[PDB]
Amino acid sequence: KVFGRCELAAAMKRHGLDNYRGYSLGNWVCAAKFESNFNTQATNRNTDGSTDYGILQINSRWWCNDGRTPGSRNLCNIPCSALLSSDITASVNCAKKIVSDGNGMNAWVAWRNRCKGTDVQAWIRGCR
Numbered sequence: 001k002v003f004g005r006c007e008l009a010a011a012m013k014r015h016g017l018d019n020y021r022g023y024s025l026g027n028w029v030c031a032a033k034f035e036s037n038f039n040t041q042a043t044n045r046n047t048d049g050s051t052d053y054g055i056l057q058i059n060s061r062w063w064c065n066d067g068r069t070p071g072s073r074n075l076c077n078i079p080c081s082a083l084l085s086s087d088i089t090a091s092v093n094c095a096k097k098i099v100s101d102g103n104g105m106n107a108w109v110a111w112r113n114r115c116k117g118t119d120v121q122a123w124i125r126g127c128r
């Protein structure tokens with residue numbers, strides 16, 4: 001699924017993501033735009049053999065199992081294939097663990113370089 005800006009905000013807000021670990025809702029829509037272009041099915045191969053999956057591009061090295069990332073962890077306890085669903089439940093619950101893990105939203109390279117220190121509220125502007 002390719003999500004609208006307002007449509008994704010309402011879904012992230014309903015799955016409790018709004019102000020999670022002090023990160024306002026704008027930081028999260030910001031990250032999804034530049035990680036996936038709001039596309040749940042996005043995949044990107046990394047040079048180490050791991051792959052990033054879904055709207056927040058969650059990495060197979062630590063967080064889920066795609067059966068081709070040798071001696072890797074599955075700390076979400078999910079197949080990576082579940083992170084590609086039109087339903088963002090899996091991606092949100094998985095993200096709650098990552099952003100809690102010590103490094104906050106810096107774990108997302110596109111948030112750090114394109115959202116951190118910007119007017120992030122702009123990303124939910126006009127939505128009900």
Ligand SMILES: C[C@@H](O)CN1CCN(CC(=O)O)CCN(CC(=O)O)CCN(CC(=O)O)CC1
Nearest residue numbers: 002003004005006007033034037038123125126
């Ligand atoms: C809502 C409208 O803006 C729709 N929009 C009309 C055309 N816009 C004109 C403008 O944005 O004033 C210029 C192109 N636009 C640039 C950008 O927005 O970054 C990219 C395409 N957009 C992406 C999006 O908006 O989600 C969809 C089409």
Ligand SMILES: C[C@@H](O)CN1CCN(CC(=O)O)CCN(CC(=O)O)CCN(CC(=O)O)CC1
Nearest residue numbers: 005006029030033119120121122123124125126
């Ligand atoms: C031409 C306009 O599109 C200018 N635009 C600024 C104003 N936009 C307009 C809007 O999207 O209605 C509102 C904020 N916008 C939200 C979003 O687009 O997702 C994020 C910033 N954008 C990023 C981008 O466009 O890729 C910068 C360019």
Ligand SMILES: [Cl-]
Nearest residue numbers: 024025026121
């Ligand atoms: Cl915000």
Ligand SMILES: [Cl-]
Nearest residue numbers: 067068069070
């Ligand atoms: Cl594996």
Ligand SMILES: [Cl-]
Nearest residue numbers: 021103104105
């Ligand atoms: Cl933090």
Ligand SMILES: [Gd]
Nearest residue numbers: 005033122123
């Ligand atoms: Gd924009």
Ligand code: NA
Nearest residue numbers: 060064072073
């Ligand atoms: Na893994």
